[PDB]
Structures are given as C-alpha cells and as structure tokens.
C-alpha cells in the first residue's frame, strides 16, 4: 500500500543499489531468483512487504528500482550476475557512450535521448504504485552521469510528480581524496541545478567511511563493497519504518519536515554508530546510551567535517532492535548536558526519535557483527558550510585559469553559467552564516 521508487544513477549509484537490494532480499527472505520460500511454511504470509517489491501471480518479487549509468559495463555486470533473474530486464543503458566526468554531456548532450525512456519507465513503475510516497535517488557528485543526468532527472520529476518527496543519497567529494580533477565543477553545477528540486540530501564521504572501516572494523584494505554495505545499512535504517512494526514509526515525509528548517539548507549528514567487528562485538555491552554517544563522536561521522566547528540545527535518531524508549530518553538527556554539543537558539527542541523492533541483518560475507540493537543518525549542522567553502575555493583556483572549461562549452554550455552557479553557492554559504547566529530582541 505504501511504496517508494529507488533510482540508481551512475556507477556509484548502481553499486550502492547492488548492496542495498542484496540487503533487502536477505531482510525479506527473497532468493536471488525472486522467489520467496517462506510461502512453503506460511502460505499467503507477508514477509516480503510491497514497499519495495511488486508481486506477480507466479510468486516472483520484482524490486521497484530503476538503474541508469550511460555506460553498459556496470549494468552488464548485473545482467550476468547472481541477481540477473531478480530485476526486471528494463535496466536502462544509453551506454553508446558515457559522460566522461562532464556535467554538460550527462545533462545537455547525451543526457538527452535517454531521459524520455527513463521517465517512461518511472511512470510505468509508479502507475503500479497505489500510494507512492517518494523517490530515493542514489548518485554521486563529481561524475558526469551522477551529476548532470541526476540534475536533469530531478528537474523532470519535479514537474511530472510535483509535491512528491525526493530524498537523495549522494557521495560528496572528499576534502583530500579524489579520483578526478574536475570534481569541483561537476559538484558546484549539480548543487546549483539541484537545490530547487530536492527535499533532503543525505550526504556521505568515502574518506570518512575509509577511516571508520580502518578504526572500528579493523579492515586495513577496504574496497567499495564495504562502503556500499555501510550505506546499505543506513538506507535500511531509514526505510525500516515502512516495512516492520515499531514503537515509534517515521514516514518519508517526516524527515524533510524535521531536518530542513529553511528550503535551501537541506543537507544533513548521516552516520551509523555500532560499526564493529565480530571480535570486538564481545567485550562491550552495546547499550542504547553507548551507541547514542557513539553517534555524536566526530570520529564516527561519515562526512569529513567536525560538528564542533558549528551548531546543530536538527537531529533524527532511528533506533532498531531491542531498544526501550526510557533508555533513548535518558541517552538524549545525557547528550543535551554536553557543552561540546551546541544547538542553535532558534531550535530548543532539536531531537526526533524513531524506534523499530526489527534488528539489522548479518549480510553473510560482510564485516559487521550481529548486534541486537543499532542506531542511525541524520544530523543537520552548520559545519557543512566548511565542506562547501573548500569546494568553492577549489572551483575558483581552476576557474581563474579557465582550466578544463573548454570541455564544457564544447558540449553546449555557456561560460557565464559557471559564474552563475558559483554565485548561487556564495549565497548558500551566506545563508548558513545567517542561520547559525544567536538571535536578539
């Protein structure tokens, strides 16, 4: 009855989606071929909820997902993988050529000739949805497709569906680590064209997750599989309230209401506290208070910033498993007494709490321990302003020389648009500076 449509854009989006749908299938008992063997014990039962999986007459469960990367390699890895029989064959490739880390290509030149097909498939998938809530868009700043085509898709979805929630899971560029030299241009242009259309953008950083895996999980050499598994756990924590019973439910429209004070500052950070190996799962209690304290440690944040350099505007704590509301109350009360954790005066409330009975799954072949309770946190802070400013400085250092700019104007873009984007980014910075100021009367 409830449902949401996941959209995976680019290589990062597709691989995160692979992790996410592996986790979902394990959570609901779906086999890789789409069959649910739990029907052999409880015929007609509901272990696979139709928030994500559409059921056919034969008993096959089809995920409500759309995959796009403008390149055949990543999707072809799915079509010949272990989950080839799960997804509908309409996994979309306009890969006659990729975007080449170019915003213009994935938005103006090659982003067209696929957009109509993608929106047609999204329309077909939504027409089966009796009570669609919103879209979960997975992409990455810095790529060609993930920036440009995601901006175009968000622009078209804002017209086709209007006041429908559009949550984004985006890979922010790291302060130091990067795999391309044109990440600032793509990120700035994406943000400029995306601010007016998204409702809430959950942000993670690969460098921070590398640090988390190194310190907490004792993985010296993590690949993207570990990062995608952690992001999958976070997404599962966010969407658990639509699927399983709980003491306190959270709908998809609740996140934007609670985490977004003003329209232009909808950039919360995400973190997942009980990241621990099986060996270190012993020797600790992993109580509600300890995990909630771990949520607020700067070391455990998944965006390379420090909340201590700013003020908390909003916080949303989603609990899973053997969690009692009294313990959550005591933990948040303990957090509110810390002088190192500041909140803006215009928000004396701060916290939202959700509680769910379903604990997380083990994902065999993974690295996380089987903890019997867990917490995800979504925190909107002003410290993210720093993470913006660095990009802006980087942008300037290139744009003063017009480095790599000809690749963008060679695909239909006008030079002045660069400046216009940067200016919109300046205003955004100022907005943060105006938001985190003590009021007077």
């Amino acid at each position: 009855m409830r449902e949401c449509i996941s959209i995976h854009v680019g290589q990062a989006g597709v691989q995160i989606g692979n992790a996410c749908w592996e986790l979902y299938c394990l959570e609901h008992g779906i086999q890789p071929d789409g069959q649910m063997p739990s029907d052999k014990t409880i015929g007609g039962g509901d272990d696979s909820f139709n928030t994500f999986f559409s059921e056919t007459g034969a008993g096959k469960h089809v995920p409500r997902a759309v995959f796009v990367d403008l390149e055949p390699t990543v999707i072809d890895e799915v079509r010949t993988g272990t989950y080839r029989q799960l997804f509908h064959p309409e996994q979309l490739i306009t890969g006659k050529e990729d975007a080449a880390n170019n915003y213009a290509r994935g938005h103006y030149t090659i982003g067209k000739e696929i957009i109509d097909l993608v929106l047609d498939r999204i329309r077909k998938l939504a027409d089966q949805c009796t009570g669609l809530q919103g879209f979960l868009v997975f992409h990455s700043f810095g790529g060609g497709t993930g920036s440009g085509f995601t901006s175009l898709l968000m622009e078209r979805l804002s017209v086709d569906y209007g006041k429908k929630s559009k949550l984004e899971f985006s890979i922010y560029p790291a302060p130091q680590v990067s795999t391309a030299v044109v990440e600032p241009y793509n990120s700035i242009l994406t943000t400029h064209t995306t601010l007016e259309h998204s409702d809430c953008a959950f942000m993670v950083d690969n460098e921070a997750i590398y640090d988390i895996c190194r310190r907490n999980l004792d993985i010296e050499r993590p690949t993207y599989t570990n990062l995608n598994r952690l992001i999958s756990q976070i997404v599962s924590s966010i969407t658990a309230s639509l699927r399983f019973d709980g003491a306190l439910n959270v709908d998809l429209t609740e996140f934007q209401t609670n985490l977004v004070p003003y329209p232009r500052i909808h950039f919360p950070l995400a973190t997942y506290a009980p990241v621990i190996s099986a060996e270190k799962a012993y020797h600790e209690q992993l109580s509600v208070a300890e995990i909630t304290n771990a949520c607020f440690e700067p070391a455990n944040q998944m965006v390379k910033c420090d909340p201590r350099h700013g003020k908390y505007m909003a916080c949303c704590l989603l609990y899973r498993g053997d969690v009692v509301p009294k313990d959550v109350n005591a933990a948040i009360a303990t957090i509110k007494t810390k002088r190192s954790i500041q909140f803006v005066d215009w928000c004396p409330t701060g916290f939202k709490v959700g509680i769910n009975y379903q604990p997380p799954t083990v994902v065999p072949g993974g690295d996380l321990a089987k903890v019997q309770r867990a917490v995800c946190m979504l925190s909107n802070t002003t410290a993210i302003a720093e993470a913006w400013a660095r990009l802006d400085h980087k942008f300037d250092l290139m744009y003063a020389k017009r480095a790599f700019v000809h690749w963008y104007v060679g695909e239909g873009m006008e030079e002045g648009e660069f400046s216009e984007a940067r200016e919109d980014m300046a205003a955004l910075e100022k907005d943060y500076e105006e938001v985190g100021v003590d009021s007077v009367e």
Partner: protein, 429 residues
C-alpha cells in the same frame, strides 16, 4: 559498444602494431587462426572493441595497415599472427617516401590516401558506435609522418566528434636515425597539435634505458621496445573492454588530463618492470607499483618530470586491489612531491581501477602524465630545425615537392608558441 579503429603507418607503426595485436590476441584468447580458445568468459563480452566476427567464430582485427614500402607488409604477413589480418586492409604503394615529409604528405601519400580512407570508411561505418581512432606511427620518417598526419587530418574532417589517439615515436636527444629528422618532426607536430585529442610521446632512448637499467636486458631489440609500448597501449583502453570498480574510457582521460586544448602531449609509463631474477625478491603491492610508476627513470619519453611541473597525471590500475590504498598513495605522492604539481589544480591525479589484470600478473598499473617538462622535447627540435633552416640545409628536397617556406615558418612558430604556453603554465601561481 565502444569500438576503436586502429591505423598503422610506416615501418615503426607496423612493427608496434604487430606486437600489439600479438598482445591483444593473447589477452582475449584469440589464436593465430582467428578462432577463440581462451578460458574466461569475460574475454568475449567486449571482443567487439578491437575485433569483428567473420564466419566460424573467427575474429578479425579492426586494423588498417599502411605503408609505402612493400617489405613491411610481407614481414607482417609472414609473422606468427599475419593470417588473422584481413587481406584487403593491406594498403601499400611501391616506392617509399624517401624519409621526406613532403613526399609522404603531398606527392606519394596523396596518391594512396584514397584507398586507405575507403578502408577506414568501410571499417568505421560497420560499428554500432565508434569511440574513436588510434594511430601508431613515427616522427622523423617519411611515410609514417606524412601519411599519418594526412590521414589524421582527413579523418578529423570526416569524424570531428570522435577521439584521435596518436602513439608516436619522437626523435631522440643524443643519436638520430635520419639526417632530416627535425623537418619531419616539426611539420608532424604542427599537424598533430591541430588535429589530435591526445598524443602519447615515446622516445627510443628512454626505452633503451628502461630495458638496460630496469629489465637488465643487454640486447634489447625492437621486439622488446614494441613489447613495452604494446603493454602501454593495452593499459590505456583496459577499462573499455573489462569490468572494474571505477571505469575510465578514452574520453574521460582526455577530459581529465587536457586542461587546455593544445596541451595534449603525454608521457607514458608502465609498472611493474623487473628483471627475470629480481622478481622473486620483490613483493608486488600497490605501494611498490606506485613507487615504480612515478619514478622519473620509468618514463618512456626521455623527458625528466623533475625539470617541470605535472599539469595532470592519470593512473590506470589492473587487478584485485583496495580503493583505500590507491587513494592514499595518490594523495601521498602529491603531498610529498608538492613542488612537482601545479597548485592551481587542487587534485592532479585521475584514478581508474580494472578488475582483470594481465594474463601472467596479479597486479599492474599504467601511467599517463601531462607535464611542462615535455617542452624540453619541442625546444630541442626547434633549435635543430632553425640550425638547418637558417642555411636551407635540405630545403630543396621539400620545395621541389611543391612545399612553400611559409609552411616551415608556420610550423616553427606554432611549436614555439606551444613551448611558450608550457613555460607559462610551469611558472604560474
């Protein structure tokens, strides 16, 4: 399905191409008969990038073999893999260009370019989507220089929106193999800057130095130089035909590495390279791969990066490895060697990772650098050029073929402008 059309011009281009088709055919499990006998199923799923299917699961290279001396074509035919090439793609004349750029560009090459372009059009229009062309040739020789530049110009006219990939052997600093090397090299560079997206500069003395110093070879024939170059050419397009954690096609490399349109002359490298005996003493890991990869002594262009600044480098890894190691190493190299990277590009390293290593290796890496030190190449040629052009040392062999002195002057001016631009971006803040 991205597809590449491969053009071979001159003796040097043809030998490099023969070795390269040997390497690629071994990579995809294609035998000298054109039939498949490999093991992995990933070898066929992107065979279309370089091969066409003919009848009996026979795979024919999408190669075009060009020369003006018939001997090279007979040498290619009688080689181990001479029987896989399409017989109609052997386009060749009778008399060579005479180590004369004008003969191969205006007089002799002009009479044979039409057949080559007919074959190019036949091969290019038989693809679902052409990614681009790649040409292997040499500067400092008649047929390679002249025909390669003429073909590049005409293909650019016909196909302005596709990638052009020139793997070229430049004149060497100490010893030359032609008396009139500076004229051909200057005119070739003048034609290359205006009609190519990326040029991979190779120098024979750098390859000799690598073979003697690193591989401990005492008789490095041209087969070994072709081996090294062929490994580089395979490394460049690895992500086009195999899956990986982080892909990168030719256009992405061109976008990330060419900050300004005319600065597209690159310095390649390959790792690991060890002697047959010293392999057992070395642990093959990413920290060692990147250490060898960024070494000044491993570059293939005989131009020291340490005399300039890197505008942008690209590293393409192959094999199962962690992303954290690659990111940390490409950050540590920049942090430790910050004086050798331009400070107005915040991140000078492009990274790509492919999951399928070469056949006998567990790990490999390909370097493609773009640095201002490449000016030391052009400057040298320019000096030699003017030393011959002041006295008109050999001009009557070129003006006798219909060339004007204005072409020489324009080529010299263009190369000097390129040198000036490189010097500007070296000394900047």
């Amino acid at each position: 399905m991205r597809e590449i059309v491969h053009i071979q011009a001159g003796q040097c281009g043809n030998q490099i191409g023969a070795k390269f088709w040997e390497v690629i055919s071994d990579e995809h499990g294609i035998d000298p008969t054109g039939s498949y006998h490999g093991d992995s199923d990933l070898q066929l799923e992107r065979i279309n990038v370089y091969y066409n299917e003919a009848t009996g699961n026979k795979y024919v290279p999408r190669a075009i073999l060009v020369d003006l001396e018939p001997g090279t074509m007979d040498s290619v035919r009688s080689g181990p893999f001479g029987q896989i090439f399409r017989p109609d793609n052997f386009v060749f004349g009778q008399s060579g260009a005479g180590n004369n750029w004008a003969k191969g560009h205006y007089t002799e090459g002009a009479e044979l370019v039409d057949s080559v372009l007919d074959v190019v059009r036949k091969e290019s229009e038989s693809c679902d989507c052409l990614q681009g062309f790649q040409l292997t040739h040499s500067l400092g020789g008649g047929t390679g220089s002249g025909m390669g530049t003429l073909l590049i110009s005409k293909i650019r006219e016909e196909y302005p929106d596709r990638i052009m990939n020139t793997f070229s052997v430049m004149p060497s600093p100490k010893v030359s193999d032609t008396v009139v090397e500076p004229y051909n090299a200057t005119l070739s560079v003048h034609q290359l800057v205006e009609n190519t997206d990326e040029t991979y500069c190779i120098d024979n003395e750098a390859l000799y130095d690598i073979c003697f110093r690193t591989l401990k070879l005492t008789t490095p024939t041209y087969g070994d130089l072709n081996h090294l170059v062929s490994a580089t050419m395979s490394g460049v397009t690895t992500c086009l035909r195999f899956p990986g954690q982080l892909n990168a096609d030719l256009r992405k490399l061109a976008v990330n590495m060419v900050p300004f349109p005319r600065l597209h002359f690159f310095m390649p490298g390959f790792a690991p390279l060890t002697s047959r005996g010293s392999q057992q003493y070395r642990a093959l890991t990413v920290p060692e791969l990147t250490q060898q990869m960024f070494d000044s002594k491993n570059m293939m262009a005989a131009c020291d990066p340490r005399h300039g600044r890197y505008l942008t480098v690209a590293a393409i890894f192959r094999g199962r490895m962690s992303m954290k190691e690659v990111d940390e190493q490409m950050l540590n190299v920049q942090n430790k060697n910050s004086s050798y990277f331009v400070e107005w590009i915040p991140n000078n390293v492009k990274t790509a990772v492919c999951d399928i290593p070469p056949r006998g290796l567990k790990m490999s890496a390909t370097f493609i650098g773009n640095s201002t030190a490449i000016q030391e190449l052009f400057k040298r040629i320019s000096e030699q050029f003017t030393a011959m052009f002041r006295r008109k040392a050999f001009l009557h062999w070129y003006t006798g073929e219909g060339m004007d002195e204005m072409e020489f002057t324009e080529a010299e001016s263009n190369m000097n402008d390129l040198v000036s631009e490189y010097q500007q971006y070296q000394d900047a803040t």
